[PDB]
C-alpha cells in the first residue's frame, strides 16, 4: 500500500522483478491492484443524472481502460496476469445493480441527425459492448431500427451496413442472423416497385415474413388496391397480402397523413362515420381525441360541425412489455436446456446440473436460481421427468 494507492513508477518498477524471482510473491499484488482499480469507476461515474446522460457514461468508461493500459504495458512489462485483473475489475463497474438499455440509446442518437467522424466514434463503442453481460441489446435495438428504416428518418445506408458489419464480427452470424434480412428488403422493395409500375403515385413496401418486430377502405382506392393482386398474378403465390392499416400512413390530396385520422377525414373532409369505422368505437374515440387535440368545431354523441378558424404540411409501457417478453423466451430455453441436460447425463448431480446448465446456457441468458428452482413443476405436471425418488440429486431417463 501507499505505492499502489499512488504511483511513483520507479518504486514498483524496481519491485516487480524481485517478487517475480522469488516464488509465491506475485499473487498478493494482483489483488492489491485489482482493489485499487475499482475506486476509479466507482468514482466520477456516480452522481451523474442529467440530460444526454448515456453519452457521459460511455465518455467515462473508456478513459479507465485508456489510462490503465499504458502503465501495465510500460512501467511493468506486459503480463497476461495483470491483464486478467483489469478485465475482472472492468466486468463489474457497468453490470452492477439500466446501462444495457442506455447503450442502445447511445447508438440511436449518433446515427440520427462527418462519415469518418462517425466511424471513428463507433470504433470505440465495440470495446464497451464486449464487457456487457445482452438479451435487451438483441431485442430492444430492432425497435428503433424499424422507426429509422420506415417513416423516413433513414441515414446513409453505408453507416447502417457498417454497424451490422462490425457487430457481426464480435458474435458471428448466430447473434445477428435476423437483421440482415430487414436491410436487404428495402433495396428489393425499390426494385419490386419498378417492375409493377409497368402494370398500369401508389408506392408500396414489402416486409419479409413475420421476423420483423413491427407488430373502412377509401371508396376511391379499390381500383388500385385490388390491382396489387396482379403482382401475385405476376410473380407471387399463396402469400396472404396484409393491408396493415394501423401503422402505415401516406401523403394524400384531401380536398395529418396517418391512416387513423385520414380514416376520420374520409368522412369528415367529405352514425355514417361510426359505421365506416369497421372497428371498435374506442379506437375511433381515440382518433376523435386526435381531432380535439389542436385546432380541431365538432357539434359534440358523435355530432360534428365545421371550424372556419382554419404547418402547411399535415413511453414506459414499451420497456414494461420488453421486461417479460424476453423472459418468456428465457423460461422456454430453461425448459429446453433442462430436458437436454438431465436426459443426456442421466447420472449427474442436480446441483452439478445447475452448474452445468449455467455453463452451457451462459451465452444465451444470465442464470437465475429461482427459475432453475421452478423448472421441475411443469415436468412433474405431466410426470415427464422420471424423477429419481431414491435421490433427486441423481436422475433416471424419462422413458
Amino acid at each position: 500500500h501507499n505505492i499502489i494507492r499512488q504511483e511513483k513508477k520507479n518504486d514498483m518498477a524496481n519491485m516487480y522483478v524481485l517478487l517475480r524471482a522469488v516464488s509465491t510473491g506475485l499473487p498478493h499484488m494482483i489483488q492489491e491492484l485489482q482493489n485499487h482499480i475499482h475506486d476509479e469507476g466507482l468514482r466520477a461515474t456516480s452522481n451523474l443524472t442529467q440530460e444526454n446522460m448515456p453519452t457521459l457514461f460511455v465518455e467515462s468508461v473508456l478513459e479507465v481502460h485508456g489510462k490503465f493500459v499504458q502503465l501495465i504495458n510500460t512501467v511493468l512489462n506486459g503480463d497476461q496476469h495483470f491483464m486478467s485483473a483489469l478485465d475482472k475489475a472492468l466486468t463489474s463497474v457497468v453490470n452492477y445493480r439500466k446501462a444495457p438499455e442506455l447503450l442502445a440509446k447511445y447508438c440511436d442518437n449518433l446515427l440520427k441527425k462527418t462519415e469518418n467522424e462517425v466511424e471513428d466514434r463507433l470504433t470505440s463503442f465495440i470495446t464497451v459492448f464486449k464487457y456487457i453481460d445482452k438479451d435487451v441489446f438483441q431485442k430492444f435495438y430492432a425497435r428503433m431500427l424499424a422507426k429509422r428504416l420506415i417513416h423516413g428518418l433513414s441515414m446513409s445506408m453505408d453507416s447502417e451496413e457498417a454497424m451490422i458489419n462490425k457487430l457481426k464480427q464480435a458474435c458471428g452470424y448466430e447473434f445477428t442472423s435476423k437483421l440482415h434480412r430487414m436491410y436487404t428488403d428495402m433495396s428489393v422493395s425499390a426494385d419490386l416497385n419498378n417492375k409493377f409500375n409497368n402494370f398500369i403515385s401508389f408506392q408500396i413496401y414489402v416486409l419479409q415474413a413475420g421476423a420483423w418486430p413491427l407488430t373502412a377502405i377509401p371508396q376511391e382506392l379499390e381500383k388500385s388496391v385490388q390491382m396489387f393482386e396482379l403482382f401475385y398474378s405476376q410473380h407471387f403465390s399463396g402469400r396472404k397480402l396484409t393491408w396493415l392499416h394501423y401503422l402505415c400512413t401516406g401523403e394524400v390530396k384531401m380536398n395529418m397523413v396517418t391512416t387513423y385520422q385520414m380514416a376520420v377525414l374520409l368522412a369528415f373532409n367529405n352514425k355514417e362515420l361510426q359505421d365506416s369505422t369497421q372497428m371498435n368505437e374506442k379506437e375511433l374515440t381515440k382518433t376523435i381525441k386526435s381531432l380535439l387535440d389542436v385546432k380541431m368545431n365538432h357539434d359534440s354523441e358523435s355530432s360534428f360541425s365545421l371550424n372556419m378558424n382554419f404547418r402547411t404540411k399535415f413511453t414506459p409501457q414499451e420497456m414494461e412489455q420488453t421486461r417479460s417478453a424476453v423472459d418468456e423466451d428465457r423460461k422456454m430455453y430453461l425448459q429446453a436446456a433442462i430436458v437436454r441436460i438431465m436426459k443426456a447425463r442421466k447420472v449427474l448431480r442436480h446441483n452439478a446440473l445447475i452448474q452445468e446448465v449455467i455453463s452451457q446456457s451462459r451465452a444465451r441468458f444470465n442464470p437465475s436460481i429461482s427459475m432453475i428452482k421452478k423448472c421441475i413443476e411443469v415436468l412433474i405436471d405431466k410426470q415427464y421427468i422420471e424423477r429419481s425418488q431414491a435421490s433427486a440429486d441423481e436422475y433416471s431417463y424419462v422413458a
Binding site: 408506392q203 408500396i204 382506392l221 407471387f236 402469400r239 396493415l244 394524400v252
Partner: peptide, 12 residues
C-alpha cells in the same frame, strides 16, 4: 397523391 403502403408476405 401518394399513399404510403406496406404489406408483409405471409405463409408463402
Amino acid at each position: 397523391k401518394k399513399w404510403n403502403a406496406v404489406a408483409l408476405w405471409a405463409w408463402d
